[PDB]
Amino acid sequence: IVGGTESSWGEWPWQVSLQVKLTAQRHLCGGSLIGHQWVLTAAHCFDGLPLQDVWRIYSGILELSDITKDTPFSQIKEIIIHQNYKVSEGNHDIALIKLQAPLEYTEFQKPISLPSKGDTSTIYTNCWVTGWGFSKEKGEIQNILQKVNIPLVTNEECQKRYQDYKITQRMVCAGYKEGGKDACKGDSGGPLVCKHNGMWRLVGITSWGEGCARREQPGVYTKVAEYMDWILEKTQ
Amino acid sequence: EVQLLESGGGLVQPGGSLRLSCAASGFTFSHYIMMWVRQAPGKGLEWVSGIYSSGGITVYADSVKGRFTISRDNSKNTLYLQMNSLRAEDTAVYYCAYRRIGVPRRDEFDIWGQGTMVTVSSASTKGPSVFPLAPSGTAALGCLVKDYFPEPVTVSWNSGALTSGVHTFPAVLQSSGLYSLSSVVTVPSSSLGTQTYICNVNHKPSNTKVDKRVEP
Amino acid sequence: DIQMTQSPSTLSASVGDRVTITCRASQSISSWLAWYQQKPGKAPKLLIYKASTLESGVPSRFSGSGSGTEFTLTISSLQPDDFATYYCQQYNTYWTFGQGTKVEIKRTVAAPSVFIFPPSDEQLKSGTASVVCLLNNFYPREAKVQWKVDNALQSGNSQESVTEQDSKDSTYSLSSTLTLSKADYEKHKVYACEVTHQGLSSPVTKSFNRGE
């Protein structure tokens, strides 16, 4: 997160850290807990490290420097990448992760609600992106979970800033005209959430974008409302 | 970030062969086209060879088609350039570079190595002859560091006591295959009868450390 | 095939100036054009790709424009870190680099101090004579150095070598070495180095007679 501040306990209790353990253990991506056994993330997180054995999922966590061998983590039982997602590309950038064991909810660890059937055409006005990603371009993984408020833009607007790629109806974009606040590397896979009728909803998954926090250069997110039939089929 | 480290460059006879390796480290979400680019002494960047995927398309500049072969071994996170039938003009710093495929994911489009040096020459390792450039407010003097192979030599004046006003020029490759350069320094002309000036020339390749005093 | 032509070859500028470099492709390449920065002995760094997109972590003082055959790199306010050689690169088909543009530090004119050094006697024994002309701390780079042996212009028998801009005063220094057989050196008396340069009101000649 660029231009953000620190989060608190219970503030974003769906936020997870997807980490790889090879010779070293590192945070690679965010994700969102959407049920006892289910995390929603970005398909691209597995583009370089497709093997589910090597991943560790941390939930109910604010600080990455808290992690030790005894910090409990979830493991992956199944990865479900969208059938039409293409390695290295922007479309259908979404993946379900079934955990090996169901997690119980606590005040620090609970699910985000998915967009409801009635809100297909809702114009969300109070949106937030969270994660442990760089605080600038070519920067560094941050320790304490960062948050930032970012307005959505139209797809026509988003498209004017990405001349060499197609922004589809299955994407949504967010940013400020003069930049300054944005996700960045290491945030990808995590939530974009908006509060609507007093209830938080997962509107986006952090997907792709050009640099971080640049003026006239909004980040791109997988638009979750358009994958709801796919999510319900795959999880039911 | 991903880092690239080259190795395997060195001295080789014309007609000889050499394998360059380029070792990648780090975590990434990206896949990469992988390229070799080289730079001959005092010249521009020249693209040489490319590979679009693990077992995908390989392509070559005309100046090396038939002689060079590019490949990967993912189990070693390494890219290779097998150079055969090498010629004097293939002498250059060889760089590997990665190029991001697909959409920008808050990340980098290019990643480059540090470069590794490749010298193709039929010349034999040889220490330099060192001749003084004898001085005539301020006066100049130097040493002519001549007929040596390969690069580099270092030049020092009075064991590093004198450094201000020193210019050591870049070596030139003479038509003979050996190199020449001079190192010069400007001093006050009043100091020429009293102050001793010695140029300390070291050529590691031939373990020769030659010292010439320079006298008017 | 695709030829790239950059211009100018070298340009001189000051901290804070706006700099503009042009690159021309022999055929259309759409927007597949990238710009690079290179320091001596170091790997190039990408600044710009798809003709106008800034690469990760590159400052916004770098911008690019153009499509088709004509492209420009612009540096809005030159910084000290920006003195370097810049290359364009088409990646429509494989990769091809332009010949590069050197962006050097501008300063006021400075005249070379000229010196001539005869071959040492220790070298004339080995069968070869080296005569070295030194041009010290001058600006700009452009300098004419002509060798004369008994007032007869020499050709094909000398090589120039030049330093990078001095870090303190931004000047250049240049050597010019005349190479001759012992036999030929001893066939003549007067060995002359004539330097023409903008820092000089007229050409300066430094010389010596073989022997004296």
DSSP E strands in chain B: the ranges are 3-7, 11-12, 18-25, 32-39, 45-51, 58-60, 68-73, 78-83, 92-100, 110-112, 116-120, 129-133, 138-148, 154-157, 166-168, 172-173, 179-188, 198-203, 208-213
Supply the CATH number for residue B159's domain.
Answer: 2.60.40.10
Model resolution, angstroms: 2.4
Residue in chain A nearest C55 by alpha carbon = A211
- Cβ-contact C2, C27 below 8 angstroms: yes
Our CA-based measurement puts residue C165 at a distance from the nearest CA of chain B, in whole angstroms, of 11
Q: Is the dihedral of CA A80, A82, A83, A85 positive or negative?
A: negative
Yes or no, beta carbons of B29 and A48 under 8 Å apart: yes
- Tokens representing C195 are 């330097």
- Residue of A45, A183, A211 with shortest CB distance to B29: A45
DSSP B50-69: EESSTTS-EEE-TTTTTTEE
DSSP E strands in C8-92: the ranges are 10-13, 19-25, 33-38, 45-49, 53-54, 62-67, 70-75, 84-90
Residues B114 and B148 grouped into a single domain? no
For residue C113, give the nearest of B215, B144, B138, B188 by alpha carbon.
Answer: B138
Residues C113 and C95 grouped into a single domain? no
Our CA-based measurement puts residue B28 at a distance from the nearest CA of chain A, in whole angstroms, of 6
Q: Of B122, B155, B184, which closes a domain?
A: B122
Q: Does B48 touch chain C if contact means CB atoms closer than 8 Å?
A: no
Yes or no, beta carbons of B133 and C132 under 8 Å apart: yes
Q: Which helix (H) or strand (E) holds A77?
A: strand A76-81
Chain A residues bordering chain B (beta-carbon distance below 8 Å): 20, 26, 28, 44-45, 47-49, 87-90, 133-134, 137-138, 165, 183-185, 187-188, 207-212, 219
How many interface pairs between B and C have CB atoms less than 8 angstroms apart?
A: 113
Q: Which of C97, C102, C115, C145 to mutate to test the interface with B (most CBs of B within 10 A)?
A: C115
Q: Of B122, B143, B167, which closes a domain?
A: B122
Q: How many domains does chain C have?
A: 2
Yes or no, beta carbons of B27 and A48 under 8 Å apart: yes
With beta carbons under 8 A apart, name residues in chain A contacting C60.
Answer: 214
Q: Which helix (H) or strand (E) holds C6?
A: strand C4-7
Q: Of C84, C107, C130, which closes a domain?
A: C107
Residues B21 and B117 grouped into a single domain? yes
Active-site residue set of A: 44, 93, 188
For residue B196, give the nearest of B158, B156, B139, B163 by alpha carbon.
Answer: B158
Yes or no, beta carbons of B167 and C45 under 8 Å apart: no
Residues B112 and B149 grouped into a single domain? no
Domain segments of chain A as ranges: 1-12+112-226, 13-111+227-236
Yes or no, beta carbons of A137 and C31 under 8 Å apart: no
Residues C16 and C28 grouped into a single domain? yes
Our CA-based measurement puts residue B39 at a distance from the nearest CA of chain C, in whole angstroms, of 10
With beta carbons under 8 A apart, name residues in chain B contacting A185.
Answer: 105-107
Q: Give the C-alpha separation, B205 to A1, whole Å.
A: 52
For residue A136, give the nearest of B106, B4, B5 by alpha carbon.
Answer: B106
- Tokens representing A190 are 């995590």
Residues B132 and B116 grouped into a single domain? no
Q: Of B61, B88, B122, which closes a domain?
A: B122
Our CA-based measurement puts residue A175 at a distance from the nearest CA of chain B, in whole angstroms, of 14
Q: Give the C-alpha separation, A95 to A43, whole Å.
A: 5
User: Which method was used?
Assistant: X-ray
- Tokens representing C104 are 């050097």
Q: Which helix (H) or strand (E) holds A228?
A: helix A228-235
Yes or no, beta carbons of B110 and C173 under 8 Å apart: no
Burial of B160 (0-12, 13-18, 19+ CB in 10 A): exposed
Q: Of C51, C72, C107, which closes a domain?
A: C107
- Residue of A26, A87, A183 with shortest CB distance to B27: A26
With beta carbons under 8 A apart, name residues in chain B contacting C54.
Answer: none
- Cβ-contact C83, C15 below 8 angstroms: no
Q: Give the C-alpha separation, B99 to B80, whole Å.
A: 16
For residue A19, the SS3 value is strand
Q: Does C45 touch chain A if contact means CB atoms closer than 8 Å?
A: no
Q: What is the DSSP letter of A109?
A: B
Residues C118 and C19 grouped into a single domain? no
- Cβ-contact C104, C11 below 8 angstroms: yes
Residues C103 and C114 grouped into a single domain? no
Residues C70 and C132 grouped into a single domain? no
- Tokens representing A171 are 């994407």
Q: How far is CA C125 from the centre of its chain?
A: 35
In CATH, the number for domain A1-12+112-226 is 2.40.10.10
- Residue of A137, A138, A210 with shortest CB distance to C53: A210
Q: Give the C-alpha separation, A93 to C150, whole Å.
A: 80
Q: Does A210 touch chain C if contact means CB atoms closer than 8 Å?
A: yes
Task: List the chains bordering chain B where 3 or more Cβ pairs fall under 8 Å.
Answer: A, C
Supply the CATH number for residue C33's domain.
Answer: 2.60.40.10
Q: Of C64, C88, C107, which closes a domain?
A: C107
With beta carbons under 8 A apart, name residues in chain A contacting C57.
Answer: 137-138
How far does chain C reach from its first CA to its final CA, in angstroms?
A: 59
Q: Does B50 touch chain C if contact means CB atoms closer than 8 Å?
A: yes
Q: Does B134 touch chain C if contact means CB atoms closer than 8 Å?
A: yes
Residues C87 and C130 grouped into a single domain? no
Q: Does A211 touch chain C if contact means CB atoms closer than 8 Å?
A: yes
* Cis preceding linkage at A50, omega within 30: no
Yes or no, beta carbons of A187 and B30 under 8 Å apart: no
Which domain does B202 fall in, by range? Answer: 123-216
Q: Give the C-alpha separation, A107 to A104, whole Å.
A: 10
Q: Is the dihedral of CA B59, B65, B66, B67 positive or negative?
A: negative
Q: Give the C-alpha separation, C176 to C117, whole Å.
A: 10
Which domain does C3 fall in, by range? Answer: 1-107
- Largest pairwise CA distance in chain B: 71
CATH architecture of A13-111+227-236: Beta Barrel (2.40)
B29: left (phi over 0), alpha (psi -120 to 50) or beta: alpha
Q: How many domains does chain B have?
A: 2
How far does chain A reach from its first CA to its final CA, in angstroms?
A: 33
Q: Which of C53, C65, C67 to mutate to test the interface with A (most CBs of A within 10 A)?
A: C53
The domains spanning A1-12+112-226 and A13-111+227-236 adopt the same CATH topology: yes
Residues B35 and B56 grouped into a single domain? yes
